[PDB]
Structure formats: structure tokens, C-alpha cells
Amino acid sequence: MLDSLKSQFQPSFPRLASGHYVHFLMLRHSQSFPVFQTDGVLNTTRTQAGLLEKTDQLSRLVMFKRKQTTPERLAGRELLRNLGLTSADKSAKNLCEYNGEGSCKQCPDCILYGFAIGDSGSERSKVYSDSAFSLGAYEQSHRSFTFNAPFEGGTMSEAGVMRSAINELDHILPEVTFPTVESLRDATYEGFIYVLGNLLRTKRYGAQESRTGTMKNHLVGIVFADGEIFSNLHLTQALYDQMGGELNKPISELCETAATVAQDLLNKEPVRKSELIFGAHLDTLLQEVNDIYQNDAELTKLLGSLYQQTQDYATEFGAL
Amino acid sequence: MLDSLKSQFQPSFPRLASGHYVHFLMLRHSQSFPVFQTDGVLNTTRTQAGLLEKTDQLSRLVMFKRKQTTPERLAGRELLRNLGLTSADKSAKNLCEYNGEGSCKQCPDCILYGFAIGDSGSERSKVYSDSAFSLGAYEQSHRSFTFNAPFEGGTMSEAGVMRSAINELDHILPEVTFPTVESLRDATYEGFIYVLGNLLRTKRYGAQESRTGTMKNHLVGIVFADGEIFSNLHLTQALYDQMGGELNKPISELCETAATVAQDLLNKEPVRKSELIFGAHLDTLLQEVNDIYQNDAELTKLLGSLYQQTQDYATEFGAL
Amino acid sequence: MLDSLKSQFQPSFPRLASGHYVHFLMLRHSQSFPVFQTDGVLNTTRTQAGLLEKTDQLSRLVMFKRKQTTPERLAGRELLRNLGLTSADKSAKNLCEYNGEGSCKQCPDCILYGFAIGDSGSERSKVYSDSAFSLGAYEQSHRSFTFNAPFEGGTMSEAGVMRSAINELDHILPEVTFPTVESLRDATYEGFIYVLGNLLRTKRYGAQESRTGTMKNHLVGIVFADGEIFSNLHLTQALYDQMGGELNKPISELCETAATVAQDLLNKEPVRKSELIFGAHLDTLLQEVNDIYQNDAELTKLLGSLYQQTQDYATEFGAL
Amino acid sequence: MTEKLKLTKRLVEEYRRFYQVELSKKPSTHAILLPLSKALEQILSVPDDWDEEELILQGSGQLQAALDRQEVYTRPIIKDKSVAYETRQLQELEAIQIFMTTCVRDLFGEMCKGDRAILQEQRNRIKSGAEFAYRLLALEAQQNQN
Amino acid sequence: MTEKLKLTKRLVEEYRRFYQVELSKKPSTHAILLPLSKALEQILSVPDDWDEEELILQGSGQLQAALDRQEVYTRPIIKDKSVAYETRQLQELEAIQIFMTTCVRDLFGEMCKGDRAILQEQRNRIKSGAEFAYRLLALEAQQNQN
Amino acid sequence: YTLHLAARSSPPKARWQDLPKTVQEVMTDVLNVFALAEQGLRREKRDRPYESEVTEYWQFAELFSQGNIVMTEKLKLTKRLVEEYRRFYQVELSKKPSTHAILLPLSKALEQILSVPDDWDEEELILQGSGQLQAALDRQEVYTRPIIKDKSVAYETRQLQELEAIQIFMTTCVRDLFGEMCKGDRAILQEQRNRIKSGAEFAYRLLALEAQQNQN
DNA sequence: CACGTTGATTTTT
DNA sequence: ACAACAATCAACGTGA
């Protein structure tokens, strides 16, 4: 499979984009009770339930923008450090501090997911997200849990007074589904294997990573196109129609329904579509990417090339 | 459908406009958290709520003037590059630098959306636009979300002391609507398919496009006319009055109300109207334009002839 | 209405003024952020706030002289080209170059709005216009908006260096109202329909038409007269006093307040007033004129007659 | 003033008739807000597939079930009078039920627009309202003689 | 009323009556104007239908459940040993409620005409002037008290 | 002539048809002498005046103002205005600084007067704007801050001297520049914003040229 | 008064 | 980047 797709990508990163988008269409299913918050409450929004049918107003959870890009991004940086292409020690020439004046201006993270410093310059991200919405209503997709913080003595008292360290937190339930489209602008084959690698290889999301927030990203399709397809919300609304407003159904059924909705929607977009990897061809592509990421020599080669390509981009078009 | 409209367009770009305006009436529906800003807050202004019945003042959001011509323009330039009509490499005969001296002055962006720098002169935009206003009130249409930047250690205090970078930003909610009337002055048929292309094919707006700010442009009419029709604010105010201020309504009913307000306003405008594409004639127009942009052999011909026409305009009337 | 109004006009254009002013009383309401500038800032002047009661000084915006006649003039010219009575191609016997030699000296623009370049003399504008003033103070009536221009790569750097392409511009807020009297001398009835057509059919005014500066002209009266009535500033100072400076009133109440102050002021002018079209008679007449400008046969006939009238004036008294 | 001044009483003053934790214990925010926490959870956790009065009567069913876990020092309607269990328990249950008429038909139905999203982005804030209101009443009632 | 202008000195003196830190400690800007930062957050965040006193109880609790999260060195009421600790709070929460009425009435209502868009555009100035007024008064007080 | 041949001229074409535009600008408001010197710098594509230009264009402003009370007051005010912020901010001209870096406190004073609603008091503007000056100064590097860089005196007294120096400058902007000269009207200030800025850059360079001589 | 007719200067770091 | 304007405002001679 991947042997054919090498022909669709740029041979080196271009100066300006030239409409070679790849779109990853995936459902992000919750395991282990996520927290997506900003101001101490779960993020929720009133929304239209569907498109054509199901016109009623509905509160749904939102995975607000950075909360789905930055777990992916940091899991990529971790792999670059593990393969030894970048370093965390401040004595090294290939250091890459995450967000600060010390941040690199030439590693794959910086050139794909973008950076700003001020002095050195800046680089707009080549990977495009948006905030993602629960397919179900919030009322049936959350629960709030109490937490307490006693002494090692097994009590809330140390002098016969109470310490009063008790509060509650609002948690997303398991099997709650966020449909998402992630998009990549004018990447190389190696830049594709890196960001796709992140989507598959990142498992923990949102607040309290140490304790919660594991998610099962099922990739539903990959679509190569001259331009941008539907929003996360338009996919969520189209999928609530096809799900008949009756979301209490299996994960494999929801994944195949999303493949059918994605293809029904793609035919209504004013974009050329060079390839549409869905169904058995995507299970063949996913397996050929899993082979790359399990094989030590091959992963080092691919991602090593990327470092060169991003170094070339940096020295020829980027922050020099 | 498009086979009948080819009669109404100019056979090539005219020197001075001869009153052949195409107007695109559309609702820009928010999909995910746009940031429409200048000077660090969501741009907002006081307006009368609606024309005649609801006469109380109402602060509404403003998608300021360029914020809806640039995403369209840049999605158009990327297609010209994708078809190979223009190029990004500084050595090529068909280079078109954005915002610079090295603008082409003879490609479709340059002729249709205009240019200004350098000795070869300027050209006024043939796409006409105005700032667009939220149908609803600002207080019902925004939320502010706080954001932070931990060190990759997963802490706020790498020095043993806090970064203190915690801030917030104001974002427009989903399903917020901006009524808009784009306009096009004395184009060719291929110029119409290019501009209508951009409006239908561009998807991202405002700050933070790589993370946020997807939108859904529902074109509700195309009106061929002898002159300027109503302002965006007048369409916003007429539509608010028509809904009686109960704006919590389905997206399709809001498009059907906009279509039936626009036809009643057009009947009160001192312009001869050659054509009024609404309803089933617009559904059948847009599917035919989709089947240009979904087909390579047709698109490359049409946008190719636009190159010629615009190159010809440049070498007969324009920058030479 | 038009069947009676016809008697007031002259049967053909005279060489000398024969009294016979028609005064178009308007409010011009801002709809989308006008820029009214000379010398790089919004034009403003200190004025007494109102005639009798509120006698304190105030700075108000100035829609300076030609900013309210060039929009009218050019919109009439593109209609004359649309009706085929004039052309923009060199080597056609009905060419009319704007502000050069090769001005027609026979078309309705040349006679009604005047000419002064080259051989074959000069002609005084039969439309008399004046600089208009904001009803409110500058401080309540403007805002400064930052604009920037990044590289197409989405950042303010192309080689690590900054672009620094950042500046402010001031724009007049929506719902800011400019009271004005346009005056037409020695017209034929068809000449009145042309000038009145320009006033109802124009909709953009300021700098940056392509992006900004839509306005709504509400004609509040038409007054047939033996000579000049009040200045724009005087109608403004009367209207501010009648509102007590309480300017946050809806446009319907503001157009009804302008109507009663204009009639109070007209009864204090040393001017025989043959006809005073206001209110329910004016919203009759405005519809009878919309019925001309929406009818292809009626408009061609009328404006074609005007062409003959203006070409006969040219051969009898004008440029021969 | 009345229509939401009376709510700035009733949001705590209608639960003070059945629940009072003594503020001098310096108890948690969670421990003071316990009636309202379990009302706002009942109101967020279900769609309109049953009536506002059904929401009131089921929510009354939650608080009368939950408060059997709290020690009896919390319940003034049991402490401050001496009468048979099945009658003081009916006085408890109907005092809980009228508190949820405020919570459902005025606090949710009017103040939170009647829409669960506009409650949900506010739940920490209207909790901090009850937190201050409980102290504003109780610390006056205790200490106003100084 | 004439309170449509000249507010900031009254606004800062009203919270300096219950919260302080000395500039000899060299504290962050965010920590000086903490009381005002919680007030402006409460005003701008909650629904536009809610009336003055409902904003006041909420805003008062929204900073009271935050000022007790740090050292008593910063609280020039609760440290006064001349008064019994339960009555120190009776002075304290009535000081918070009068600071909170001047921000909901004088600041938001009069100075910003009650419009959240006007207040949001000017928020950083309304902050920076109270930070400066606080330093100006604190480094004046140490001159005259010696 | 030496001001008209700097601005409203081209190197082979003196454009004496514009001398009536150059004189009317010089007479209307004396700070236009510095607005024209900046236009000449723009034509000559030179980023800063010579040391000679800083005293030439000032001796011209003092010459054309000589008989007039409001011009001599405005020319004394624009010097005093900068001589006040130069007590707490000094970018060294040797480092080739930008016109913006020289005008950091005056640009942040004027933007404050122009951005606030017209209802708010002078004594509120003085506090909000001095906050923004303190906030801006603390983001520059320590060598630019004359009161704080001088380690000789106790830290609260460096803070106390900074706060009262910022307050007296902001009081001159809001009382004398805006209230008296510009009639307390933002329209009249907006027209002058450009020539006040140009006049303050020439004042800063003159005060610096005078300091570097007299410090011997 | 009423017809008709058509050439010339030298230059502003 | 780049324009600071553009035109027009007799002087005779000859015959009736």
C-alpha cells in the first residue's frame, strides 16, 4: 500500500503550500474517564443535534483545540529524543526546548506543528486541527466524582479538627465518541508517517494524564485532496443523523457508519480527491505503518530523513 | 444550469466596469470557535437590533473587513499553484509573491482581488466585500477560554518557580451566523467560477487557523444586477426582525428565512435584476460548480482560460 | 406623483440659471465602517453642538466635498455604459474618458456634473453639493483598527527577519448619520430621475470601497424651490438640538425627526416653495422611481431622452 | 428587586430549614453546598423526556436518600423539635421538595435560561454564590451581637 | 450620578481595607490586583440577564474562596487579635460586599455603561491603573506612618 | 528655503510652487518644522538626523516661534515633556535605536488618552497610563532605566522615585498636552499625534546632544 | 466693422 | 510604492 502513496507527496517541503492536503478522519473514543476543561468546568456547547433530521438544540462536550494537538505533538518530540535526533540536556547542539527562546527552529516538531519565539522567527503549523465535539449529548456523557485528601493516618483529622480537603470533579464517561478531522499541508512521505505515527501512538489526553484520559483513536479514513473538507462539527452532525439519534450502539458499527458518512459527505465538497483510503485499504495501510513503527532500523531511517528534510527546509526557507 | 449563465458574463475583462454585478448572498455559520480580532479583543459594535419592530440597541460581533476576503483569496492562489498556472519558486517565469513587489500583476488573484506595490502600478479589486455582523448579540455569541503553557516536564515551575504565562482569549461560539453579501464587478464566466470557487472551497477564518476557526458558507442566492444591493448590516437587521429575535432556530430554516428576506429586499432596490438564482435553481447551480471543482480536465481548462483572460487584460489595459 | 412633478421641470436645459432648484434632503447612515480621509486621518472639525439650546463646542466628522459626489457621478456613468449610451473602448464615437481630454461633452455626466480639461471649454455642475457633518461627536463615532500583512506562509518572517507590516487606521462606526442637502439646478424631468437615481442606486462612499464603506441614503424630503435652502451644518445643528444630543435613537425615529426639523427650517427660508414632497407622498414617489430603475424599457427610454436633451444642450449652448 | 433578591435568599435559606453544617467547624465548600450540589447534578444529568414536576419529585428522592449518610448534627428539622419519626421525616421530605421547586422552576427554569449548557458553564459560580450566601446569613445570625 | 468618572482610588482603597501585600516583598502584578481580577472575571463571565445583587453575592464568594488559599500576612482583617476570630469574619465579609458593590455599580454599571463589550476592551487599563494606584498608596503610607 | 528643500522638494526640482504649503504649515503649528524634517529624512531614505540637523531644525523652530505666545509655549512644552520622561527612560542613541524605541513612553501616553471612553476623568487617565508606562518599562532591559539601574540607593526608594517620575510625566501629558493645548478633545489630539511624536524625537536627540556635551 | 489668417522662447545645485 | 497637477485666457491684415 504505502509503496504507491510515496508518489502523492512532495519530494521536499515547499516554500508555500500548493494544495497537497492529506486529511485524517478519525473517531476518538474515550477510555478511563477524560477531563477536558479550561475554567474549572467541562467544556460544553449548545449545538444543533443533526443536519436534516434531528433539528433540536443539544448540549455536547467539546475537546477544545490545543487539547488534541499537543498530546500528539509531545509524543512526537519524545520519539525524536528516543531516536537521538534531538536532546533534552542544555549542553547539546541538537537541544529542543518545547516552548521558549531555547526552542529549536529546525527539528520535525518545529516545522510540522509550528513555533513562535520573536527573535528567531516563527513558523505556522502544517498540521491543522479544530475543536472536536461529542457525538452524544452532555447530559448522558458525563458524571461528577468526589475526591478527598486525608492524612497518612487514614483520617481527615490531625488535631481533632477536620482539614476540609474534599471537592468534586466533572468527568467524561468511557465510550463517549468525538469525531475529528486532522489535516496536513504539503508534507513529504516521511512527514506523513510522523504525524500519522502520532495519531496512532498517542493514547493519553486532557487533564490528569497521570491518572485518566486514555483514548482509542480509530482512524476511519485518509483522503488526499486539493483543499479542505468538512468541519469536525459537520461530521458529528452528519453522523448523528445516520445514527438515527440512537447513539447506544457498538464501536465497530459506529466506525463503519462514519466511513459511509465520510464518503457521502466527500462527494458534496468542491475539492479534487486524489485518493480515498477507506475500508480494507486503510487496514492494509495501518498495518504497513505499524510495521514501520515496530522495526527499529526502518523507523530510524524514515525519521532520520525527516530530520534532514526539516533541516533543509529550515536552512533554505525557514528561520535559517 | 451554468450553460445558461454564460450569456450574461463579459466575453473578456472590460477596461471600465459596465454595470454587470454578480452578488453572492451567503450566511457564514460558525463551526468551531473563531477569533475575529484586531487590538486584542473580539471586535464588537453597537447596532439597532432589527429594522422596524425590534428597535432596541444591540452589541454584535464584527468579522472585520479583510477577515473574509483573505482566506478566499489565499485558497484561490493555492489552486493556481496546484494547477501549475503560478509558482512559489523565485526562479520561475510565473512567480507571484503575496504582499510584495514581486506580485505577478497578470494572474487571476492580481486582476480579481487587486494589487498596489511598485512601478507597474495598482489594480482595484473586482471582488467587492464589506465587514459582516453577527445576527445575534455578542453576549449570547461568545465565550472566553483560559490557556496555559507547561514545561514538557508536565509542570508550571521548571526553575522551581512558576512561568506565570496563564492568560485567556475570547472566542465566538459555534452556530453563530454572519450574514454576508460578496459582490463581483464585470467578470468573465471563468472569473465567476473562480470567485464562487473560493467562497465555496475556503474553510478557515480569523486568528489561529491551524488550530481553530472553521466555518460553513451557505450560499442563499446569486443575484445578477445593474448595481449595488443592500449592506451586510441591512441583511442582518432585516433577518433579525423577520425572526422576531428568536434566533435559536435550525440552520436550514435560517437559510430559508434569509432567502425569503433577500427576495423581498431585492424588490425594493433600484437595480434591474437580470437573474435571481434562489432555491432549487441554486441547489442545481452549486452541484454543477462542484462538478467543475471535482473534475481535473474541466477545472484545468477553466482556470486555464482565466489565466489567459487575465494575462490578456494585463497586457491590453492593466500593468503591461 | 411623477405625472404631476413633470410640470415643475424645464422642457430643456437653459444656458443661464432660471431659478428652479430641486433640493434632495437626505440622511446618509453608515453601514460598514467608512473611511473619510485626506492627510492620513479621519476628517473632523470643531462646531457648535446645536443651534439654540446646547451651545457648547464639539468635534464632528466631515464627509468632505467630493466624498459625496464622486460615488454618485461614477455610478451614473456605469449606468450610461450599461444602457449603451456611452462606451469605454477607444475608437468608439460615444467614448467618455473620466477627468481627461476625451470626455464626451454631450453625455448626462458631462452636462449635470461638469467638465474642465483641455480644449472645448468648461461646464459648471448643475448638481450643487456640500460637505456633510456627523450628527454626533467624533469620540462616539469612530474606532482605530490595527491591520497587518504576513507572508502567505502565515507568519511575519520569510528568512527569520521580521516584516513589521503593522499599522492603525481609523474607521467611522456603523449607525453614524450624516444629514445633507443635495441640490439640482435647471434640470429636465429626466435629469431629476438621473440624479435621484444616483442618490438611491449608489451604496459605497469612502476609501477602500472594495472592502468597506457601505452607506444607506434615506431621502427625507424633496423641495422644489426659488433658491438655496439651509447648509448641511445648519440641518445637523438643528437635528442635534431637537434630539437634545440623545443620539442613541433608532433610524426610523431619526428619519422622522429630520422630517419635522427640515419643515420647521423651510418655513424660515426666503424661498418660494413650489412643492414640498415629504413623508407619505415621498414614499409614494420613491416607489414610482424604483419602478423606473427596475424596468428595462422605461429606463432606456427615459435616460435615452436625457441623452438627447444633453446632446442638444451641447450642440445649442455647450461644446457644439 | 424581589424576583431574584428572594432567590439570593432561597438558594440557601430554603435548605437552611433542613440542612445546616455549623460554620465554626470550618467545613469544606463541598460540605456546605451538599443540597445544591445534588440538585444541580439531578438537573444536568437528564433530558426533558419527563416533566419539571417529575424532576422535582425524583430530585427530592435523591436528597432524602443521600442525607441518610450525613450525621444527624447536620439536620435542624430533626435537632430543633421533639416529634415522631414518620412525621418529622415528612416535614424533611416536603422541605426538600419546595427547595427543588426553587432549583427547577426558578433557578434552572428562569435564571439558567432553562437550558442545561448555561447552567453547566456557571455551576462553579452559582456554587460560589451559595458559599457566600450561607456565610452571609449564618455569621450574621451567630455574631451580629458584637 | 457623578461616579461615572474618577473611580480607581475609591476602588483600590475599598480592597486595601481587607487585602494587602507590601512592595518590600516585591510581589507579581497578578497578586496585587487579585481582588479586582476575580471581580472583573465574575462580571464578564456570567449571563447578561442577572441583576446587581446576584452579581455581588457570587463575586464576593468567588474571591473569598480564593484569598484564603494563601498566607494570613496578606489579610489585614483576620490577623487583628483585638477581635474574636468568628467576629473578624463579620467585619471581613461586609468589607468584601462593599468592594464588590462598587465594582458592579460604579465600575461596570456607570464607568463602562453596563456594556460587557466596553468593559472587555478596557479591562487591561482598568487593571493597570489599580495596580499603579495600589503601589502609589502603599509606598506613600510607609512615609507618613513613621 | 532650507526646510522646503528638505521636504516638498526633489533633488533636481525645488518645487517652489509648494513654498506657500511649507510656510502655512510652519506658521499654523511650530512642530510642523519637525514633521517636515522627518519627510526629508524619508525622501533621503535616511533613518536618523545628523547631530547638526538636530540643532538646525530646532533653531528654526525657535526662530519661527519667536513672536508667538502659544508656539513658544508648545515648543517649551514638547521639550519639557521629553525632559520629564528622560528622567526615567534613556535608550542610548549610539546603539542606533528606532523612532519607536525613542518614543516608547510618549506613544503609550497618547494611546491611553485616545483609547479610553470620553467620559473618564483626567485623574483616572493619569493612573491607568502610568500603569501602562510602568508595565512597559519593566519589559525593556535594565540599562534603559536611569532610576532602577543605579544600584546606589535602597530598592523601595528606586521604586518610589520611578513611580513619582512616571506620575509627573503622565500628568504633563493629560493636563498640559491634552487638556490645555489640545482643548481636551481627542479629534484635535489625533491630528497632532504625528507632529507631537516628530517634535519629541527631535527634542530627545537635542536633550541627549546637550547632556553629552555638558556632562564633561 | 466684418471678413480672413496662423509664427514665436530657452531652461531653475 | 508613487503621483504633487491638467487648459485656457491674440495679433494682425484686407475689403466694404
Coordinates of C-alpha atoms in Angstrom, one line a residue, chain A residues 76-274:
Chain A
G76 CA 6.4 13.1 18.6
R77 CA 9.1 15.1 20.4
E78 CA 9.6 12.1 22.8
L79 CA 10.2 9.8 19.8
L80 CA 12.7 12.3 18.3
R81 CA 14.6 12.3 21.6
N82 CA 14.4 8.5 21.8
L83 CA 15.8 8.1 18.3
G84 CA 18.5 10.6 19.4
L85 CA 17.7 13.2 16.7
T86 CA 17.1 15.9 19.4
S87 CA 18.2 16.3 23.1
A88 CA 17.0 17.5 26.5
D89 CA 20.4 18.3 28.0
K90 CA 21.3 22.0 27.9
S91 CA 25.0 21.2 26.8
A92 CA 23.8 19.6 23.5
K93 CA 24.0 21.2 20.0
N94 CA 20.7 19.4 19.0
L95 CA 18.7 20.6 22.0
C96 CA 15.0 21.4 21.5
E97 CA 13.2 23.2 24.5
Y98 CA 9.4 22.9 24.0
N99 CA 8.1 26.5 24.3
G100 CA 10.6 29.3 24.9
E101 CA 13.6 31.2 23.5
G102 CA 15.6 27.9 23.7
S103 CA 13.2 26.2 21.3
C104 CA 14.7 24.7 18.1
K105 CA 13.9 26.2 14.7
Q106 CA 14.8 23.1 12.6
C107 CA 13.5 19.7 14.1
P108 CA 10.3 17.9 12.8
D109 CA 8.2 19.2 15.7
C110 CA 9.0 22.9 14.9
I111 CA 8.5 22.6 11.1
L112 CA 5.3 20.5 11.2
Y113 CA 3.5 21.7 14.4
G114 CA 4.9 25.2 14.3
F115 CA 6.7 27.6 16.7
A116 CA 7.0 31.3 17.7
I117 CA 9.9 33.0 19.6
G118 CA 10.2 36.5 18.4
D119 CA 13.8 36.9 17.8
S120 CA 14.4 33.9 15.7
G121 CA 11.1 34.0 14.0
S122 CA 8.1 31.9 13.7
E123 CA 6.6 29.1 11.6
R124 CA 2.8 28.4 11.0
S125 CA 1.8 24.8 11.7
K126 CA 1.4 22.4 8.7
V127 CA -0.9 20.2 10.8
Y128 CA -4.4 21.7 11.1
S129 CA -6.9 20.7 13.8
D130 CA -10.1 22.0 15.2
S131 CA -12.0 21.6 18.5
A132 CA -13.9 18.3 18.5
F133 CA -17.5 17.6 19.7
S134 CA -19.1 14.7 21.4
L135 CA -21.5 12.7 19.1
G136 CA -23.8 12.3 22.1
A137 CA -25.5 14.9 24.4
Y138 CA -23.6 16.1 27.5
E139 CA -26.4 15.0 29.9
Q140 CA -25.7 11.3 29.1
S141 CA -21.9 11.6 28.5
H142 CA -20.6 12.9 31.9
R143 CA -20.6 12.2 35.7
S144 CA -19.1 14.2 38.6
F145 CA -17.0 12.3 41.2
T146 CA -15.9 13.4 44.7
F147 CA -12.2 13.3 45.7
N148 CA -10.8 13.6 49.3
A149 CA -7.2 14.1 50.6
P150 CA -6.7 12.6 54.1
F151 CA -3.5 12.3 56.2
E152 CA -1.4 9.1 56.0
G153 CA -3.1 8.3 59.4
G154 CA -6.2 7.2 57.4
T155 CA -8.3 10.2 58.6
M156 CA -9.3 13.8 57.8
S157 CA -8.1 15.0 61.3
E158 CA -4.7 15.7 62.8
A159 CA -5.6 17.8 65.9
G160 CA -9.3 16.7 66.2
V161 CA -10.3 19.4 63.8
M162 CA -11.2 18.5 60.1
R163 CA -8.7 19.6 57.3
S164 CA -11.6 20.1 54.8
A165 CA -9.7 18.9 51.7
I166 CA -12.8 17.4 49.9
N167 CA -14.1 18.6 46.4
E168 CA -15.8 17.1 43.2
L169 CA -14.7 17.0 39.6
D170 CA -16.7 16.6 36.4
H171 CA -15.5 13.7 34.2
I172 CA -16.4 12.5 30.7
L173 CA -17.6 8.8 30.6
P174 CA -16.0 5.9 28.7
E175 CA -17.3 5.0 25.2
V176 CA -18.1 8.8 24.6
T177 CA -17.1 9.5 20.9
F178 CA -15.5 12.6 19.4
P179 CA -15.4 12.6 15.6
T180 CA -12.3 14.6 14.3
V181 CA -10.6 15.6 11.1
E182 CA -6.9 16.3 11.4
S183 CA -5.3 17.8 8.2
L184 CA -1.7 18.1 6.9
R185 CA -0.5 20.7 4.3
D186 CA 2.2 19.9 1.7
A187 CA 4.2 17.3 3.7
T188 CA 6.7 14.7 2.5
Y189 CA 6.1 10.9 2.8
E190 CA 8.2 11.0 5.9
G191 CA 6.3 14.0 7.4
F192 CA 3.1 11.9 6.8
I193 CA 4.5 8.8 8.6
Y194 CA 5.5 11.1 11.5
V195 CA 2.1 12.8 12.1
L196 CA 0.2 9.6 11.4
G197 CA 2.5 7.9 13.8
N198 CA 1.5 10.5 16.4
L199 CA -2.3 9.9 15.9
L200 CA -1.9 6.1 16.3
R201 CA 0.9 6.1 19.1
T202 CA -0.6 8.8 21.4
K203 CA -3.0 7.4 23.9
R204 CA -3.4 9.9 26.9
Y205 CA -5.4 13.2 26.5
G206 CA -6.6 16.2 28.6
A207 CA -6.1 16.9 32.3
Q208 CA -4.7 14.5 34.9
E209 CA -2.8 12.4 32.3
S210 CA -1.1 10.5 35.3
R211 CA -4.5 9.0 36.4
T212 CA -7.0 9.3 33.5
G213 CA -7.7 10.2 29.9
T214 CA -6.7 7.2 27.8
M215 CA -8.4 7.3 24.3
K216 CA -8.9 4.9 21.5
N217 CA -8.3 6.8 18.2
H218 CA -9.9 4.7 15.4
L219 CA -8.8 6.2 12.1
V220 CA -11.8 5.9 9.7
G221 CA -10.2 7.3 6.5
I222 CA -7.3 9.1 4.9
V223 CA -8.3 11.4 2.0
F224 CA -5.8 13.2 -0.3
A225 CA -7.4 16.5 -1.7
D226 CA -6.9 19.8 -3.4
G227 CA -8.4 21.6 -0.3
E228 CA -10.2 21.4 3.0
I229 CA -13.2 19.1 3.6
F230 CA -15.9 19.3 6.3
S231 CA -15.5 20.5 9.9
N232 CA -15.5 18.3 13.0
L233 CA -19.0 19.5 13.8
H234 CA -20.4 18.8 10.3
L235 CA -19.1 15.2 10.6
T236 CA -20.6 14.9 14.1
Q237 CA -24.0 16.3 12.9
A238 CA -24.0 14.1 9.7
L239 CA -23.1 11.1 11.9
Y240 CA -26.0 11.8 14.5
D241 CA -28.4 11.8 11.6
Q242 CA -27.2 8.4 10.3
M243 CA -27.1 7.0 13.9
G244 CA -30.8 8.0 14.0
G245 CA -30.3 9.9 17.3
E246 CA -29.8 6.4 19.0
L247 CA -26.0 6.5 19.9
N248 CA -26.2 3.5 22.3
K249 CA -24.6 1.1 19.7
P250 CA -21.2 -0.7 19.3
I251 CA -17.8 0.9 18.4
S252 CA -17.2 -1.2 15.2
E253 CA -20.7 -0.2 13.9
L254 CA -20.0 3.5 14.7
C255 CA -16.7 3.2 12.8
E256 CA -18.2 1.7 9.7
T257 CA -21.1 4.3 9.8
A258 CA -18.5 7.1 9.9
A259 CA -16.8 5.6 6.8
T260 CA -20.2 5.7 5.0
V261 CA -20.9 9.3 6.2
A262 CA -17.4 10.5 5.3
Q263 CA -17.8 9.2 1.7
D264 CA -21.3 10.6 1.4
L265 CA -20.0 14.0 2.5
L266 CA -16.8 14.0 0.4
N267 CA -18.9 13.7 -2.7
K268 CA -20.5 17.2 -1.8
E269 CA -17.2 19.1 -1.4
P270 CA -15.8 21.3 -4.2
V271 CA -12.3 19.6 -3.9
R272 CA -10.5 17.1 -6.1
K273 CA -9.7 13.9 -4.3
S274 CA -6.6 12.1 -5.4

